[PDB]
Amino acid sequence: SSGLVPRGSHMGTMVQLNEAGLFKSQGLIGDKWVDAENGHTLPVNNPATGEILTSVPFMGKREAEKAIAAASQAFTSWSKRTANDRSKILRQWFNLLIKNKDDLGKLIVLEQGKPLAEAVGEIVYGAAFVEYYAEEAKRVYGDIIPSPFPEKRMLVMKQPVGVVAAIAPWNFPLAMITRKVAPALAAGCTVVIKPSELTPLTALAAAELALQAGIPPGVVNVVMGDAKGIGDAMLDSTEVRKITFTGSTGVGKMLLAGAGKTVKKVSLELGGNAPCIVFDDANLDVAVKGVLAGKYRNSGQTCVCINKIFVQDGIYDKFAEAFAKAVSGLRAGNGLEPGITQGPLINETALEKVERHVQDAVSKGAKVLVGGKRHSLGRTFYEPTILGNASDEMLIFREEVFGPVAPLVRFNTDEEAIKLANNSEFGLAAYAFTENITRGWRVAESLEFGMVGLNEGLISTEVAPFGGMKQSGLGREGSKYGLDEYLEMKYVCLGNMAQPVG
Amino acid sequence: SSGLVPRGSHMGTMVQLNEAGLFKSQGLIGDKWVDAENGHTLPVNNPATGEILTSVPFMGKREAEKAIAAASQAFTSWSKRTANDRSKILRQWFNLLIKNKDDLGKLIVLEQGKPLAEAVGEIVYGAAFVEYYAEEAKRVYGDIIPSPFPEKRMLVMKQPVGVVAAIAPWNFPLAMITRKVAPALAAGCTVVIKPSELTPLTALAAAELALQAGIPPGVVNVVMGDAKGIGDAMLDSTEVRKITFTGSTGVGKMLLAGAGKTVKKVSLELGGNAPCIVFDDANLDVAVKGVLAGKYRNSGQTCVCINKIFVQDGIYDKFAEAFAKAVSGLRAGNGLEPGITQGPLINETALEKVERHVQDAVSKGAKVLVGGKRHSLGRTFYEPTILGNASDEMLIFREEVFGPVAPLVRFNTDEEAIKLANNSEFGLAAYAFTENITRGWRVAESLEFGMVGLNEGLISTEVAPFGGMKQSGLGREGSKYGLDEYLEMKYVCLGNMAQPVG
Amino acid sequence: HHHSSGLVPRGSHMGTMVQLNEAGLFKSQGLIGDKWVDAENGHTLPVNNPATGEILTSVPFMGKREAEKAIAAASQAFTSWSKRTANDRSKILRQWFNLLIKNKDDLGKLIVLEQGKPLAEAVGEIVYGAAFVEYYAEEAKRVYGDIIPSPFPEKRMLVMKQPVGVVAAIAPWNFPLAMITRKVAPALAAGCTVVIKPSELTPLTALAAAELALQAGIPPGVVNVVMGDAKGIGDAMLDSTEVRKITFTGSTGVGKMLLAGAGKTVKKVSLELGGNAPCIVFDDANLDVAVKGVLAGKYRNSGQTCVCINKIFVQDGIYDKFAEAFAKAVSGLRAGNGLEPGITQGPLINETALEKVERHVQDAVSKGAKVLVGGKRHSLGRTFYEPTILGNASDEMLIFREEVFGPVAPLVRFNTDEEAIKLANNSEFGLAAYAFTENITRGWRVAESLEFGMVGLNEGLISTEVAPFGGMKQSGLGREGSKYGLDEYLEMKYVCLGNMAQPVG
Amino acid sequence: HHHSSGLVPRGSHMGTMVQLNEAGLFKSQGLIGDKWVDAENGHTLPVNNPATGEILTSVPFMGKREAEKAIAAASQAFTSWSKRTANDRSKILRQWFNLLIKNKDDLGKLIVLEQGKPLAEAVGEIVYGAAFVEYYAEEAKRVYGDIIPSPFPEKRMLVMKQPVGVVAAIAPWNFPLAMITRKVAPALAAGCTVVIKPSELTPLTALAAAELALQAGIPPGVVNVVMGDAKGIGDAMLDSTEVRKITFTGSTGVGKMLLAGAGKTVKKVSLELGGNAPCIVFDDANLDVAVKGVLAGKYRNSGQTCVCINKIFVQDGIYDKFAEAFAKAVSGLRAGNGLEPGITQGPLINETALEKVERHVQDAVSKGAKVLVGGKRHSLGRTFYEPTILGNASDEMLIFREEVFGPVAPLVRFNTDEEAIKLANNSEFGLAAYAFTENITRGWRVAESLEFGMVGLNEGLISTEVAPFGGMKQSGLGREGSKYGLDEYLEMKYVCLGNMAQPVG
d(CA B448, CA C500): 19
CB of B134 closer than 8 Å to CB of B123:
no
Alpha carbon distance C5, C21 (integer Å): 19
Beta-carbon contacts below 8 Å between A and B: 194
Distance CA D375, CA D422 (A): 29
Distances A147 to A155, B483, C77, C346 between C-alpha atoms, Å? 9, 19, 22, 48
| Encoded amino acid at B499, one letter | Q
Best residue of C258, C265, C459 to probe chain D, by most D CBs closer than 10 Å: C459
End-to-end CA distance of chain D: 87
B1 burial class (0-12, 13-18, 19+ CB within 10 angstroms)?
Answer: exposed
Helical (H) or strand (E) element with C389: strand C388-391
Give chain B positions within 8 Å (CB) of D440.
434-437, 440, 454-455
Integer angstrom CA distances of residue A257 from A485, B95, B132, B470, D489: 18, 41, 34, 17, 50
Q: How many CB pairs under 8 A join B and C?
A: 60
CATH 3.40.309.10 boundaries in chain D:
277-464
Q: What b/e sequence results for D194-228 when a residue is b if at least 16 CB atoms lie within 10 Å of its CB, and e otherwise?
A: bbbbbbbbbbbbbbbbbbbbbebebbebbbbbbbb
Q: How is domain A11-270+473-488 classified at the CATH fold level?
A: Aldehyde Dehydrogenase; Chain A, domain 1 (3.40.605)
Active site residues of B: 269
Q: Which fold has domain B274-454?
A: Aldehyde Dehydrogenase; Chain A, domain 2 (3.40.309)
In the residue annotation, D402 being an active-site residue is answered as: no
Beta bridge partners of B243: B165, B266
C-beta atoms surrounding A101 within 10 Å: 19
CB of C399 within 8 A of CB of C390? yes
How many CB atoms lie under 10 A from the CB of residue A313? 11
Residue B164 to residue B329: CA distance in whole angstroms: 44
Q: Residue B464: which of B476, B447, B449, B472 has the closest Cα?
A: B476
Residues of each domain in chain A carrying CATH 3.40.605.10 = 11-270+473-488
What was the experiment behind these coordinates? Answer: X-ray
CA A325, distance to chain mean position in Å, is 30
SS3 for C132?
helix
d(CA D143, CA D135): 13
CB A162 within 8 A of CB A192: no
Q: Catalytic positions of C, please?
A: 272
CA distance B161 to B181: 13
Task: Indicate the Cα dihedral angle B309, B315, B320, B326, nearest 10°.
Answer: -90
Sort residue A197 into left (φ over 0), alpha (ψ -120 to 50) or beta. alpha
Smallest CA-to-CA distance from C388 within C309, C277, C480 is with C309
Strands, E assignment, A322-362? none
Closest CA to B203 of B186, B234, B179, B237: B179
- Which chain A positions have a beta carbon within 8 Å of D499's beta carbon? 438
**C486-489 own/partner pairs: CB under 8 Å, 24+ apart:** C486/C136, C486/C139, C486/C140, C486/C143, C486/C186, C486/C189, C486/C190, C487/C161, C488/C186, C488/C245, C488/C247, C488/C268, C488/C270, C489/C163, C489/C164, C489/C167, C489/C186, C489/C187, C489/C189, C489/C190, C489/C192, C489/C245
CB-CB neighbours of C366 under 10 Å: 10
Q: Which segments of A are annotated as binding site for NAD(+)? A: 168, 170-171, 194, 197, 247-248, 270, 303, 353, 400
- Residue D273 counted as an annotated binding residue: yes
Write down the H helix ranges in B432-495.
Answer: 437-446
Q: Does A461 contact B496 at a Cβ distance shorter than 8 Å?
A: no
Helices (H) and strands (E) in chain D, counts: 16, 20
Show the beta-strand stretches assigned E in A324-459: 367-370, 385-388, 405-411, 429-433, 451-454
Rounded distance between C-alpha atoms, residue D63 and residue D40, angstroms: 9
Q: Which residues contact A48 (CB under 8 A, 6 or more apart)?
A: A113, A333, A334, A335, A343, A344, A379
| Residue ranges of chain B assigned to CATH 3.40.309.10 | 274-454
Comparing C-alpha atoms, which of A346, A402, A304 is closest to residue A114? A346
**Do A346 and A301 form a contact (C-beta atoms < 8 A)?**
yes
Contacts of A67 (CB under 8 A, 6+ apart): A27, A29, A30, A192, A221, A222, A223
Looking at chain D, the domain(s) classified CATH 3.40.605.10 span 14-273+479-491
Q: What one-letter code names the amino acid at B89?
A: I
Is C88 in contact with C140 (CB distance < 8 Å)? no
B11-16+27-270+473-488 is classed CATH 3.40.605.10: yes
The minimal CB distance from B496 to the residues C138, C441, C500 is found for: C441
DSSP of B143-175: EEEPPSSTT-EEEEEEEE--EEEEE--SSSTTH
DSSP conformational letter for B462:
T
Q: Which chains touch B (3 or more CB pairs under 8 A)?
A: A, C, D
What is the CB neighbour count within 10 angstroms for residue A50?
12
Q: What 3-state class would DSSP assign to D60?
A: strand
Alpha-carbon distance of B404 to C81, in angstroms, equals 41
Q: Domain D277-464, CATH 3.40.309.10 — does that match?
A: yes
Residue A495: list chain B partners with CB under 8 A.
286, 290, 453-458
Q: In terms of C-beta density within 10 A (0-12 exposed, 13-18 middle, 19 or more buried), how is residue A480 classed?
A: buried
Report CA torsion sign: C484, C485, C488, C492: negative
Q: Provide CATH 3.40.605.10 ranges for chain B.
A: 11-16+27-270+473-488
> Which of C87, C138, C496 is the best residue to mutate to test the B interface, defined by the most B CB atoms within 10 Å of its own CB?
C138
Cβ pair A344, A48 in contact under 8 A = yes
Cα–Cα distance, C372 to C234 (Å, whole number)? 43
Distance from first CA to last CA of chain C, Å, rounded? 87
Is residue A39 left, alpha or beta, with left meaning phi > 0 and alpha meaning psi from -120 to 50?
left
Residues of D in contact with B82 (CB under 8 A): 149-153
Would the CB atoms of D498 and C289 count as touching at under 8 Å?
A: yes
Torsion angle (degrees, nearest 10) of CA A180, A182, A187, A190:
70
Show residues of chain B in contact with C500, CB under 8 Å: 438, 441-442
**C14-273+479-491 under CATH 3.40.605.10, yes or no:** yes
Q: What are B488's strand-pairing partners?
A: B159
Q: Are D78 and D90 in contact (CB under 8 A)?
A: no
Annotated binding site of C: 171, 173-174, 197, 200, 250-251, 273, 306, 356, 403
Distance separating alpha carbons of residues D310 and D275, to the nearest angstrom? 8
Cα–Cα dist B435/B432, whole Å: 10
Sign of CA dihedral D161, D165, D170, D174: positive
DSSP three-state, residue D163: strand
Calpha distance A209→D373 (Å, rounded) = 57
What gap in Å lies between CA B181 and CA B133, rounded to an integer? 10
Name the residue among D210, D190, D1, D25 with its Cα closest to residue D113.
D25
3-state secondary structure of A184: helix
**Minimum-distance CB partner of D498 among C244, C293, C452:** C293
